Amino acid sequence: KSDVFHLGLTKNDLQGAQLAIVPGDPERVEKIAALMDKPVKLASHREFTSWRAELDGKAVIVCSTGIGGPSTSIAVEELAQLGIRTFLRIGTTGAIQPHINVGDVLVTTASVRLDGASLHFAPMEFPAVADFACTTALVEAAKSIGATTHVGVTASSDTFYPGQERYDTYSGRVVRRFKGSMEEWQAMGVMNYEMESATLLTMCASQGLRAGMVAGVIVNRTQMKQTESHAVKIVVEAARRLL
Amino acid sequence: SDVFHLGLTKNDLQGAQLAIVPGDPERVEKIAALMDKPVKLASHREFTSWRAELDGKAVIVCSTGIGGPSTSIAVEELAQLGIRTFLRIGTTGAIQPHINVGDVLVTTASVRLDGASLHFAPMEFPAVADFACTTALVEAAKSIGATTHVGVTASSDTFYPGQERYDTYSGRVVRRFKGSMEEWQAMGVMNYEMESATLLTMCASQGLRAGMVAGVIVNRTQQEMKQTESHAVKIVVEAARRLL
Amino acid sequence: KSDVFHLGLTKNDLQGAQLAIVPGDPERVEKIAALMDKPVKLASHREFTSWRAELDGKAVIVCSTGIGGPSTSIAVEELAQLGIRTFLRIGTTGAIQPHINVGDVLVTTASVRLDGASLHFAPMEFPAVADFACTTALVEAAKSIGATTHVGVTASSDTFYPGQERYDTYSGRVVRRFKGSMEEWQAMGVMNYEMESATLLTMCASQGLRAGMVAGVIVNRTQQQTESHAVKIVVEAARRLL
Amino acid sequence: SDVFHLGLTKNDLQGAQLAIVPGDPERVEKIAALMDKPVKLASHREFTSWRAELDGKAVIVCSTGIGGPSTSIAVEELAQLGIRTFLRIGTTGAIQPHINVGDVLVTTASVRLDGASLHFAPMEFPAVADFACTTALVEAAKSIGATTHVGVTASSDTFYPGQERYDTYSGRVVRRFKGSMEEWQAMGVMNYEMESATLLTMCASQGLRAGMVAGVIVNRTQQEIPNSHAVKIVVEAARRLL
Amino acid sequence: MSKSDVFHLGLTKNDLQGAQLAIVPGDPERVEKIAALMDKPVKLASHREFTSWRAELDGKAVIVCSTGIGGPSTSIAVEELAQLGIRTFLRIGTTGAIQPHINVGDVLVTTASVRLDGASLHFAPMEFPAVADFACTTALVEAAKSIGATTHVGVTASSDTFYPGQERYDTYSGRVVRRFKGSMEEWQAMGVMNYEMESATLLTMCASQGLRAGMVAGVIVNRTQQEIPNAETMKQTESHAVKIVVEAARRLL
Amino acid sequence: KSDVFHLGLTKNDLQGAQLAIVPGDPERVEKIAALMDKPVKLASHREFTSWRAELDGKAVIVCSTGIGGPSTSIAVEELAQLGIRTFLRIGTTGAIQPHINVGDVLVTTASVRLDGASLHFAPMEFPAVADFACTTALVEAAKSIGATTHVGVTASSDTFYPGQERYDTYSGRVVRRFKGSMEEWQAMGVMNYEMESATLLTMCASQGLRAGMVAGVIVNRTQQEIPSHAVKIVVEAARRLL
């Protein structure tokens, strides 16, 4: 019956929904919809698990993207085909600034495009910027639930290891492009490393789709469980102010 | 004198943390005179600088001139003097059919069709405006009830070929920029201007807060009145109040 | 508990294994593992389901990579941390050549790097090339079972849609870089489109690891059972690389 | 007015086909005053224009302002008005230990460290001055007896990080320009400035003739920021191109 | 056009006698020596850096044609031979190894090249792999076993210069442009076997046009070792790699 | 026997020479050298044929470079090692402008860098500019010999065929980068295609060596695609720089 190639979903399945909360982990999908009205599992294929929920009478989608830009770009595109116009990304991130602690919540304004997929939508010249209303909603909801929040630039990498300048690896080597890259992003005022924002933000911003980015700090490079739900409450509360 | 170009000493600013930065040296005094105690400080090359006061706190109005290069001088030297927040007011060319001459555009981030931005950060780095500054600008525009569009701006190092203008001497647009206007349109870019990429990049990569606002003087879907200038000017000053 | 951050595995779970068949789909793991002796499930986290099996009394690994180079870079890296030196990828592909049909088996010599993750291991000048022994084992395993095989260059994209030049999408546009791209890879003799080989092949070739790639054709682009043949080939290839 | 920025008509030129183009608008009058019948034409933004007469021929003096963009406006609009020959006169920073403050530097071609040049020609294309324009400048310099150095000039879109200045607000320079001055120096580049790349590229690729000449005001092997032979040369050079 | 189907090489389709394989050395002087390992070799033409000979291998006609040093002259040779009817190109060259484990006199077979050249970009963008044909590489590896050489199979760095691109400081200048500064070490860590000057162009332009191409080279110097080989640095290193390229060609006719 | 690796020459062989005429054809070395006094053959190895000659009783070298940058970069570097500080290239060229004719002499000020070897000396931003004194003598020699001479930009390709947008080729196809590039170079006022100037000028300008570039038009590309003044000019130009 499916409308799209990967998600295994019809336009009818969205039930009029126009906004989607897009977490990375399939196992975090249900936990998010649970904070909303009438949650029901829609479909689960590959790393794309999807649920439908309700927020103030209007339908919303929660759908996982998986790790990295490519997988994300499949999800966002197919959700867009289905009718979704607003994308809210929740995820996890590693802070590169000393003042940001494990537990702090990060709202991304724009991202450093250290990926490949963004270039398949707009040339490097193009800014991987978030939607203004989405970011506003993400911050005003963050201030409203009493979260220690930092708003700024994120480094978005195609690799977990070398692109985020991790040295404790099989080779122990980091390619020239990324040698001392973290020290540079730090100096530029970049808050954090994650893997999906550059793709999400570029492909939405260059296709009239609205996207926001929020993430909870798991590790701090320079240096628990209640940490996560803050970003989960925020990404759900922000959704209400966007419907 | 403390800085090489602006001819300003730290004292001339006297505590000022924010600077409204127009393009035209002639547009400077006109903006400074919407605030309290407007005093001319210096004037050298294309950099004309005035000091005004806003709610009892000192503010700088300083022209950047045309292009990223001269912007990179004015900004750098104002930053040396203690300015931490920049609000650029400018003129702009709309490339979207729904944006009319007279409107106000608040730039979230800029398409880096320049060279100067690369001297601060590689191309991967976004040319994004400071969040607080964008908010101030948008809310200032909301209050005075101006027609406002918030989105992406194409920031070129040239007025003509980089903005795909053909009524030129050569009538030629180099491959890179041939058909590029139709491309920016499809991507949801609102406008062309010539400074934002440089300003927004050099600020977001050095801890400086920057905002971008511009009045639409032309719509590119048509060709290549006066309430346009003063509307964006009222906004940039109103936003300034809120970042002091 | 675990010697690696993502896979949820220890060196012990591998039992001395040095070869990993690396499929895309987690669902494909058990199937591939079941063509071998003593197949056992190891772990399953995110997009990485891992099984261990045996061939001629040698420990073999089957571990999924998910979609795209990013997650592929995680699996390969963490398998490298646990002892794997030979990586055989099996996947699915859309053939861009007119005379490569649905059901055909394709062995990748090297890949057109239309990805990001590979640049995190080597500059663009460096070739996304397969190991020769792996490629040899793959082609020879392919010909020994009679499958229609093609040996050549694969275009490896970071997107399923604009990078593989699909216009049949939400916006209907393809970025300038990729507009008319498929028609150019065609004349260059590129066989097919997929999404992982550029990363896999680059990160192995520049890090002293061995990698090979085989894929069954599910789509012919100039236009718009199959599974088990590539699966048989990848196991038969693995057999010849222990 | 026939042009958007300069505020000038073709008639203001009086058949002038040559424009001496300074950076600083406050220096236009001074150049024009060294010629016959100097008449102020217009002043808008950073563009101040004067007509002058030389050997009984109309010659424009019009300022460009700091940087490629502001220059690319002035040149284009002067070219629309009738100017076909462009001589830039400005200030520069020497990067060779043996170039003295006051020396005149003639540029043969420029290191394209700018952005505007790419809006006229791809990076492969040389930012090269016109031969006749360069000759006129060298021959003029040798006739007045100024200490003259002829060679390549690094043309940066910024005054500070692109010219590797460290006495800045942040005190940092981006990776690309970290140790870039030493490289230009080893390659025998004479000096830094901000307009020549743009001028020379946009002219040489549009059938317009351009020469470049500058006065040394600071030596970069000693200071970052400092504590008119150039002017006479650009006028005499113009005299020979009329 | 003094009886020539091509501009540079000075050859006609007839000169080839239906030869579809060409062994392509870099040095015009090496051409006669290589054809001398085959039956009925005859000089065809000699213009510029392109000296060509026809020989017979297991009864079938084969071309030996020099390319000259670098991608530009190689691309001319390959293109013009392809017009004449050549579909398979086997390059036999000399090389400098960069791995400590690769000794002088060793034989190296290239799977693919690091594109430090310019001419390859005239056939495909930088993302396209400078990969050798599978059958050509298979033929060379098997031929190496037949001759009994010490063989390594892997990635080669193909440079457009002999000096700064191969990070040689022993030059008039003594400087190396930022791009190639500390590059050899990086290639070493990336397992690159050797430096040479033609493979990247040959392999790209052949793989991107339906032509089969192989690459074999003999190590005449190791860039990490102190001791540099005697008068016959090439003489019997050539004899190994040349004997292999000819043997590989037998299995591609 | 030899102080250099390729040319087979010793510093003594040059007899104090500091200027070299560098043709691209080893067979044309003798002819060129034959126009001077005391022409002695020195060496022939690979594509590098080197003669010594005397001009106004001052030693001069004629050394072939072969086709392309790589081969040229070796010759120049090794001649430079042996004492040569001035290089004068004399090649054949294909004109891309309608007004330039078969037989016309083309003097290069600077080159469009469509090569790879130049990048081994300077980044792309650095201009491939000829030495001012070298060009001057070449233009002056051009007047002396009396020939239709054009001075300007040259497009310097790493291929005879696709980089010069030729279609009389095996495939009949040209890569995106160069498809429609010839007329693009036309509109930019580029005079001609050749294969060695970008490397020669870049490697000399960025290394403190003097370089000059002259050529004889053998084909006009607006009309077709395939098949001594320049020789005399490059010899007479040498006389002015010894």
Ligand SMILES: O=c1ccn([C@@H]2O[C@H](CO)[C@@H](O)[C@H]2O)c(=O)[nH]1
């Ligand atoms: O420092 C970090 C912290 C978290 N992640 C997240 O972890 C996932 C990969 O495990 C990615 O989706 C990414 O969002 C990182 O990549 N880097």
Ligand SMILES: O=c1ccn([C@@H]2O[C@H](CO)[C@@H](O)[C@H]2O)c(=O)[nH]1
């Ligand atoms: O279409 C337009 C309209 C206005 N401007 C503005 O006008 C100035 C130069 O004309 C620039 O600083 C820019 O802000 C443009 O660049 N393009």
Ligand SMILES: O=c1ccn([C@@H]2O[C@H](CO)[C@@H](O)[C@H]2O)c(=O)[nH]1
């Ligand atoms: O035309 C195709 C056919 C299959 N795939 C494969 O399908 C997976 C995504 O569904 C990717 O990992 C990729 O290997 C493509 O990318 N393109």
Ligand SMILES: O=c1ccn([C@@H]2O[C@H](CO)[C@@H](O)[C@H]2O)c(=O)[nH]1
């Ligand atoms: O060291 C120097 C000296 C002068 N200038 C010139 O001075 C003006 C701005 O200071 C610009 O036109 C620029 O070309 C520099 O850029 N760097």
Ligand SMILES: O=c1ccn([C@@H]2O[C@H](CO)[C@@H](O)[C@H]2O)c(=O)[nH]1
């Ligand atoms: O260290 C070496 C040894 C040999 N060659 C080869 O020798 C020729 C030039 O000497 C070139 O064709 C090249 O392939 C090198 O480039 N580098």
Ligand SMILES: O=c1ccn([C@@H]2O[C@H](CO)[C@@H](O)[C@H]2O)c(=O)[nH]1
């Ligand atoms: O159209 C032409 C004509 C001649 N040449 C010259 O001829 C030689 C190759 O035949 C090269 O040195 C090159 O400079 C070209 O490159 N293109």
